[PDB]
């Protein structure tokens, strides 16, 4: 239903080990489709999903030229940040940027995003109006003024409302088999004794796409959020995801506990119980 495209840039200075390294990856929803590494032999934007390979030589050459220029822009940005923060040339620092567009269920732009960070902290963000900026600190206000003066936001708004939505819609169509056909989780409950008087019930969801999912444990139809251990959703490596939720149960009460799975690939939310063999 809802879809999004995002690009993630990481630029890191490496004093005494090499020139600054720049990495860019692009995602449609939870599927990576391009990458660029300034450290690779002969840096090029490379495909990372089958459906992007259909693009012509000018696409790959155009992306590669843009990424090379961006890597050079962020080299400069790292030097500029050293000024604003009065930092030495000896340490390694990181600039990050993430930007892209969100489409609502109708396939039209729902929201645009553009955020930058310095050393892991918010630096500057384009506001939801796509016309003004939010600076996290006084250094970022220096950048904010330069970007207002150079009409940066108008150019980014044009990209986010235009080419971003326009290329995302094209990628979704070209990759509809995998991008628009959700995989429901395969689910089961496992039981692990802790002692003769207690056990862990673990609710598993495997092989699902996209990554969004809800796993909850209920006791007598009551939710047990405080007593549920949730691991973060993790990639299986084949473009699907995994998650589990666990609860510690007194022996003899196992059948009062139900696991509830909500995932867009499922017609109705599943309800599961320990089904001992």
């Amino acid at each position: 239903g809802s879809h999004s495209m995002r690009y993630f840039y990481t630029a890191m200075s490496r004093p005494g080990r090499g020139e600054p390294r720049f990495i860019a990856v692009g995602y449609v929803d939870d599927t990576q489709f391009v990458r660029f590494d300034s450290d690779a032999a002969s840096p090029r934007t490379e495909p990372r999903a089958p459906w992007i390979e259909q693009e012509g030589p000018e696409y790959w050459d155009g992306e590669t030229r843009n990424m090379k220029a961006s890597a050079q822009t962020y080299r400069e940005n790292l030097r500029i940040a050293l000024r604003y923060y009065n930092q030495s040339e000896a340490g390694s620092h990181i600039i990050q940027r993430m930007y892209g567009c969100d489409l609502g269920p109708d396939g039209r732009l729902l929201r645009g995003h553009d955020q930058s960070a310095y050393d892991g902290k918010d630096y500057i963000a384009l506001n939801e109006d796509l016309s003004s900026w939010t600076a996290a600190d006084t250094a970022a206000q220096i950048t904010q003024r330069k970007w207002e003066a150079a009409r940066v936001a108008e150019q980014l708004r044009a990209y986010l409302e235009g080419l971003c939505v326009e290329w995302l819609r094209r990628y979704l169509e070209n990759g509809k088999e995998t991008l628009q056909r959700a995989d429901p989780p395969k689910t089961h409950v496992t039981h692990h004794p802790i002692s003769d008087h207690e056990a862990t019930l673990r609710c598993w969801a495997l092989g699902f796409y996209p990554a969004e999912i809800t796993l909850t444990w209920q006791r007598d139809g009551e939710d047990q959020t405080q007593d549920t251990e949730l691991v973060e959703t993790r990639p299986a490596g084949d473009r699907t995801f995994q998650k589990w939720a666990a609860v510690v149960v007194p022996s003899g009460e196992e059948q009062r506990y139900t696991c509830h799975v909500q995932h867009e690939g499922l017609p109705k939310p599943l309800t599961l119980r320990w089904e001992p063999h």
Binding site: Y7, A24, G26, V34, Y59, G62, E63, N66, M67, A69, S70, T73, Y74, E76, N77, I80, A81, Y84, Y99, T143, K146, W147, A150, V152, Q155, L156, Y159, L163, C164, W167
Partner: peptide, 9 residues
């Protein structure tokens, strides 16, 4: 398709 960086920090 990626945006083109417009301007410096």
């Amino acid at each position: 398709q990626a945006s083109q960086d417009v301007k410096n920090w």
